Design a protein around this ligand. Structure first.
Ligand code: A1IMU
Ligand code: A1IMU
Lengths: 304, 304
């Protein structure tokens, strides 16, 4: 049994990761078929970062300015296109190991695997969630940019994130693979703080269900509640408003544990109102909100 | 910046994972060159599990009893050998994608990546530590057995663990790739509980150093201490005795933060004696002991 923060295998993505060099700047690229994707700020100097005009910066740039390196192989750029905040570089080769793939923009609450890369080479993989504020709590050093976040349907890799910037609080922002930022952020060295970081209620309820499954159950109260009731408690503790689909979604888990959603909503309610009082649910001494109902099911089923 | 529990890329290991079927039982195998490694309890029936005599069970078994499946390919077994609690199956093919590899037995405190597998296909990867008791806190369902834990030196994969059983408390035990159990455990369905789970002191000190680096510093006290002093506090809170090498090892971190080891030993000392009082160091409301000094450095350097 047992339960951990666990990421999708990285093998399929690994072999799509290449180094991109334009001038001084060097960051990571995603190579699918004969296109290579990268953050457009690869063309920016440090003096530009303050206030860049990417179109204008693009004038002076040509195919030959972009050094794309796949291990020890210098892919020939033969065409370059900007899309929102991504650069796409047409190359003369197709990636032999392009998998079945897709670009998806995820909703806030949804989780993905992040393969961290420095110089086209992967350092590590870790799982995180798209937070309500639209930020992520990543692990990212200078060089990391152009790393991507993904899910797999054991066949088709789904690309949701590409990393661009770090923010106050030491959190992160980035783009879908069409280069639109999650959240009202821009690629610019300017003051742009995050909003209020709210907790993903449904995700916690899943974590609590995962505890029951596993055996931790001390938090299980004898009371029930209402949706309206609980949502009136939730806003006080900056949790996200729990809806009916959210209820629907927790059904299978409810099914498996024989604990109605709304009873679990009341177990949580007291934990908000009374804290864990220095006990540990599933190892954590905090309420974990970075597991989707699906993420739990994956792990309490053995899906591959 | 930011800091996460992060696992080595799984790509190289992924392509060494195969399904092994002997009778009803079906578990995972590691295929390197022309040998396939699996837990020997693949030859056990449920009636055997109670008390198995593997030698005796082996008599009735032949090369043709072991179905090794690499995706949709039925590797020909041509020789079978038992080593402690592992089965090695000689096959007529070499694994095309065998990486530079090694078998290492790790010490308690050392961490590795676990690639969880069901039916030769990987479900997920996650990082955990070999605990002082010699157990691991894994995520493992029936089917998981024969999954392996590894580190990579970005070249050479080092194999340290292969998963066999789950224990009371919902923790796990297993073997090096030579099939010797970590800890005084046997492959048998019998009563065999773990010992006292102690905390890996040095690992926590690293986590604390990772906080300072990142920016969390509220726990930094104005006091210092002694090794003997702190170790007298540690035993009370079931932490591992901190030694001089452990001090030596924390040097680079000390170097980077300009905080002597022994000052950090005093910051910890109060946290033991006073608890976090419902604050969060690096997201966790608990003292995290599953990061090696090296693990921190990797992540606060960008090693690949
Ligand atoms: C990325 O460009 C890269 O890897 N390039 C090789 C880089 C990655 C980040 C740096 C360290 N960790 C990271 O995730 N990101 C940037 O340098 C980024 C460039 C974007 C396009 C404009 N960037 C530039 C300038 C400033 C910041 N962030 C801050 O300094 N913000 C901040 C202000 C106050 C307090 C805390 C943070 C930035 O991310
Ligand atoms: C493994 O054999 C497998 O995957 N086979 C296909 C399997 C994996 C575990 C089952 C669920 N999670 C796991 O990690 N392990 C076993 O079945 C294992 C076999 C070993 C060789 C003897 N095994 C058999 C019998 C009993 C246990 N453990 C317990 O039931 N122990 C226990 C007692 C009391 C309280 C809690 C646990 C066992 O692991």
């Amino acid at each position: 049994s047992g339960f951990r923060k666990m990421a999708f295998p990285s093998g399929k993505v690994e072999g799509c990761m290449v180094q991109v060099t334009c001038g001084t700047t060097t960051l990571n690229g995603l190579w699918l078929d004969d296109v290579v994707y990268c953050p457009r700020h690869v063309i920016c100097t440090s003096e530009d970062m303050l206030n860049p005009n990417y179109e204008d910066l693009l004038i002076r740039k040509s195919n030959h300015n972009f050094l794309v390196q796949a291990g020890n192989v210098q892919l020939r750029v033969i065409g370059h296109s900007m899309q929102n905040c991504v650069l796409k570089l047409k190359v003369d080769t197709a990636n032999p190991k392009t998998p079945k793939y897709k670009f998806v923009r995820i909703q806030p609450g949804q989780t993905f695997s992040v393969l961290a890369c420095y110089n086209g080479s992967p350092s590590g993989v870790y799982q995180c969630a798209m937070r309500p504020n639209f930020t992520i709590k990543g692990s990212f050093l200078n060089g990391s940019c152009g790393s991507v976040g993904f899910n797999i349907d054991y066949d088709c890799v789904s690309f949701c994130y590409m990393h661009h910037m770090e923010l106050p609080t030491g959190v992160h922002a980035g783009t879908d693979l069409e280069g639109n930022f999650y959240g009202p952020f821009v690629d610019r060295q300017t003051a742009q703080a995050a909003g209020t970081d709210t907790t993903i209620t449904v995700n916690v309820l899943a974590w609590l269900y995962a505890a029951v499954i596993n055996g931790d159950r001390w938090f299980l109260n004898r009371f029930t509640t209402t949706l309206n009731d609980f949502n009136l408690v939730a806003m006080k503790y900056n949790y996200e408003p729990l809806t009916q689909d959210h209820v629907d979604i927790l059904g299978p888990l409810s099914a498996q544990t024989g604990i109605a959603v709304l009873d679990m909503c009341a177990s949580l309610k007291e934990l908000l109102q009374n804290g864990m009082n220095g006990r540990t649910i599933l190892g954590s001494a905090l309420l974990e909100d970075e597991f989707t109902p699906f993420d739990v099911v994956r792990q309490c089923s053995g899906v591959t």
